[PDB]
Amino acid sequence: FEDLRVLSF
Amino acid sequence: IQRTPKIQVYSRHPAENGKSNFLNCYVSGFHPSDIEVDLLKNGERIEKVEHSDLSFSKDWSFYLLYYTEFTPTEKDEYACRVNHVTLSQPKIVKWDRDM
Amino acid sequence: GSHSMRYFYTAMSRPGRGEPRFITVGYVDDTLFVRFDSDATSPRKEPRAPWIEQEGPEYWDRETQISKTNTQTYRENLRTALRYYNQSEAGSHIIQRMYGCDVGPDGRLLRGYDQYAYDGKDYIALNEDLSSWTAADTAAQITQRKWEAARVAEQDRAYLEGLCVESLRRYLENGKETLQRADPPKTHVTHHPISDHEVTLRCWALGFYPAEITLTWQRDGEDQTQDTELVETRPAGDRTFQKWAAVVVPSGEEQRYTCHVQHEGLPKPLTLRWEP
């Protein structure tokens, strides 16, 4: 299962 | 900074003349990811060669497996031809059943 | 034994040839189990191993959505990196990510990872403490300050200690007949003269899984590291791996050399010789 949290550089 | 591919050409099982097998060309340790790989039978390009899903190692370098079903013989010569931005001309590595 | 789960992202700009391509591959040890490719007609996470196929439609929807969102985020990341390195819009660039976790035989966390690269060089990485970052340079320090203000490390630590470990426990059980089966190497030693007074002894290991193996030559029991030719471990294409190690020895002295093989699939390490 991937981590669903995302924030760009 | 760019890394030139390592190349190995070999069979899935130890070669036996007349018995069906797979001819593999493993390209690894390269960067960037674009690469051109051909499998050759007596200097000619083998059609419909398949490849693995592009992946990369711990050091960020990429690797791919190119492969085709084949029946080795004493006389038929096999090789792999690789091109990449780090190479000024395509590199040909011959298949040696002992390597 | 011990196991890993890893996701690998590649985002590669291609000026003049459309928008940047985004690919994800997921592995358990040396087994690919999922893939996503933004260039597909219907971009979606696809199963690549039978034990993940059994996952319901809610799994595929969640996994596909994460990757579709990542395609857009990583196109933004590529524009940000171009700006932080003062680069022109003309060249092709690549961002890579590798994240996941290692677990021991008891299923507990050994360590987690969340690493990023730009053009094949380190950019930013979560430290082993799962609470601080190593930025490679002043460009990556900008992302570090942004991620510190947003408490990204704390979120990564929760994922790595929780869902990462739990999904690896689930996958290892559902795929136990393959993922937890170590196939030992089939071995043999070949002999090839190189001159009238020297010969090559090549020790082969074929058909093994996982890729991890140790192949060494000894002369009377002493390691021959600097005089051994090794090839990189290579995939056979049927899940298994191959490797060989070769030494050049005096003709008539072949029986002084032993090839030593260690692999998880073997009941005991092997000690082999050339069999004339």
C120 to B32: CB separation less than 8 angstroms, yes or no: yes
- Cβ burial of C73 (10 Å; 0-12, 13-18, 19+) is middle
- Which residues fall within 8 angstroms of residue C157, CB to CB, at 6 or more apart? C112, C130, C131
Residue in chain B lying closest to C23 (CA) = B54
Q: How was this structure determined?
A: X-ray
In angstroms, rounded to a whole number, what is the distance separating the alpha carbons of residues B35 and B50? 14
Helix (H) or strand (E) holding C35: strand C31-37
Identity (one letter) of the amino acid at B38?
Answer: D
Same CATH topology for C1-181 and C182-272: the answer is no
Domain C182-272 sits in CATH 3.20.20.70? no
Closest CA to C217 of C243, C245, C252, C194: C245
H-only helix segments in C117-268: 138-149, 152-161, 163-174, 176-179
Domains in chain B, CATH or no CATH each: 1-99 (2.60.40.10)
In angstroms, rounded to a whole number, what is the distance separating the alpha carbons of residues C85 and C140? 10
Q: How many CB atoms sit inside 10 A of residue C137's CB?
A: 14
C120 to B31: CB separation less than 8 angstroms, yes or no: yes
Tokens (6 digits) for C35: 């893939």
- Boundaries of every domain in chain C: 1-181, 182-272
Residue owning tokens 């084949």:
B70
Quote the longest CA-to-CA distance of chain A: 22
> If you ran DSSP here, which 8-state letter would residue C254 be given?
G
Using a CB-CB cut-off of 8 Å, the residues of chain C touching B93 are none
Mutation site, C163, C166, C170, C171, interface A, largest A CB count within 10 A: C163
- Residues C173 and C217 sit within 8 Å (Cβ to Cβ): no
Residue owning tokens 């029946």:
B71
> End-to-end alpha-carbon separation of chain A, Å?
22
In angstroms, rounded to a whole number, what is the distance separating the alpha carbons of residues C124 and C118? 9
SS (H, E, C) chain B: CCECCEEEEEECCCCCCCCCEEEEEEEEEEECCCCEEEEEECCEECCCCEECCCEECCCCCEEEEEEEEECCCCCCCEEEEEECCCCCCCEEEECCCCC
Domain C1-181 sits in CATH 3.90.190.20? no
Neighbours of chain C (3+ CB pairs under 8 A): A, B
Residue owning tokens 């797979």:
B22
